Write a protein that binds this ligand. Structure first.
Ligand code: 2XL
Ligand code: 2XL
Ligand code: UDP
Ligand code: UDP
Lengths: 230, 228
């Protein structure tokens, strides 16, 4: 009964600006922020996260599997907690900052194709992912995906314009890898998956390349008309 | 369905005690250890590879091994709890357990500096969640402790003649060995699953070879099951 709607987009695309924008417009609207976002900083799950995330930066081939499995286990559990945590709400909609699907099909597929996950590591990640998400049935199944499309140069700007010292090192090409994978999975709609319904699951695209903090009303209008189709 | 775990050190006899035990009743079934099936499919092949990695670089693959194994155990005990549909007094014998994984090996890799604090507390955090969402009912109704000396096990690894095992050093079979005693005799260890503090335990000296001679061992097993 509580509508799940994931927001998808490249690093610094604006996901979390938009999500905290929407949160304020409807008591019928809540947010689930992504844990790694949470971890990207300066509870045991934080201690562990900034750690693994710091270790991920310094030597990604050593740390990729662990960190993926922990970004995703941390998300699955954070997702379920907002469901049990919009009870009374007449038209419940909850917004996920990214998804188990972006965990596996953009980020863990990137690192694998970019050689930080050898094949044993990837088939284990993907096995572990299948088994855990066939075991939720349709608890965490998405009614919708809003794609916060932008450009990698606007994301590098946004990164340095966000000032996370550790995020300053991520180069454009990497951003360009994650751009290529979003384009293909969402906008182009081609990337395959092991999940049935994510082929017949509706997708909103939105150009966030211009600052939207003061001028976001059209973006919001899009979001709503979109939620009435779903 | 009743649930027992058969625990004990490497080549101590579990697979034997179990291949024997399952034969004595149509009301009895076994879930053999994932790790031992690796010792072919995406489990096998994912299982076979990392095991072999884990012998070469243990400080690099214990998290990954320790996650995959617990998973595959959780998997297999669940597709098995499957068996014993038409039985009056049905028992499933688990060849090791989710606590074996954690409080024997995964603790022992950490203490051995083959996983770090992050890894080791990430595994802990995941074990605690992966057992509480999908694994509530893999809950044991007792435990069976096959107790060989650190010494007995090493010869029984030679017997089996597994190549990569014949590299298991004696000193390894030793700490694994004082950690079973602690959890399952002295009850010197304490875990994070409280019903486990009130699970009964039957412990069997298995230094004497029972490949022909298991009757009185089985007698206490039958006896222990009759006290649940
Ligand atoms: C933006 C902080 C998280 C990081 S750090 C990082 C990374 C850093 C340095 C690297 O090489 C120097 C690299 O190959 C990856 N990639 C990432 C993206 S991996 C990822 N991020 C998420 N937010 C979620 C998820 N499931 N996976
Ligand atoms: C029995 C084969 C699996 C291995 S391999 C291994 C090992 C091999 C070489 C090592 O040093 C190079 C080492 O420190 C450990 N320990 C083990 C035991 S760790 C373990 N065993 C299980 N049966 C289950 C589980 N979760 N963990
Ligand atoms: O219209 C916008 C959207 C975002 N940002 C900035 O872009 C950076 C990244 O935004 P956000 O934290 O949402 O990124 P994400 O959650 O996607 O990493 C932040 O410093 C924002 O202040 C901006 O200036 N204008
Ligand atoms: O009482 C025994 C128990 C075992 N074995 C042999 O020792 C080897 C290893 O034992 P097992 O695999 O059963 O031990 P586990 O690791 O399963 O506890 C096998 O070849 C058995 O045939 C034996 O000769 N006598």
């Amino acid at each position: 009964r509580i509508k799940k709607i994931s927001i998808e987009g490249n690093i610094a695309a604006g996901k979390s600006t938009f999500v905290n924008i929407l949160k304020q417009l409807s008591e019928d609207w809540e947010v689930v922020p992504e844990p790694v976002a949470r971890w990207s900083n300066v509870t045991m799950e934080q201690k562990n996260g900034g750690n693994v995330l710091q270790m991920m930066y310094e030597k990604p081939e050593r740390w990729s599997f662990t960190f993926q499995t922990y970004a995703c286990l941390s998300r699955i559990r954070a997702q379920l907690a907002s469901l049990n945590g919009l009870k009374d709400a007449e038209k419940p909609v909850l917004f996920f900052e990214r998804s188990v699907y972006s965990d596996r099909y953009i980020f863990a597929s990137n690192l694998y194709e970019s050689e930080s996950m050898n094949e044993t590591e990837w088939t284990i990640y993907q096995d572990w992912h299948d088994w855990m998400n066939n075991q939720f049935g349709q608890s965490l199944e998405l009614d919708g995906i809003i794609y916060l499309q932008a450009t990698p140069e606007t994301c590098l700007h946004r990164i340095y314009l966000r000032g996370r010292n550790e995020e300053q090192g991520i180069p454009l090409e990497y951003l360009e890898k994650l751009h290529y994978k979003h384009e293909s999975w969402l906008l182009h709609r081609t990337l395959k998956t092991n999940f049935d319904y994510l082929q017949e699951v509706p997708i909103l695209t939105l150009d966030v390349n211009e600052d939207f903090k003061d001028k976001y009303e059209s973006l919001v209008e899009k979001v709503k008309e979109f939620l009435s189709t779903l």
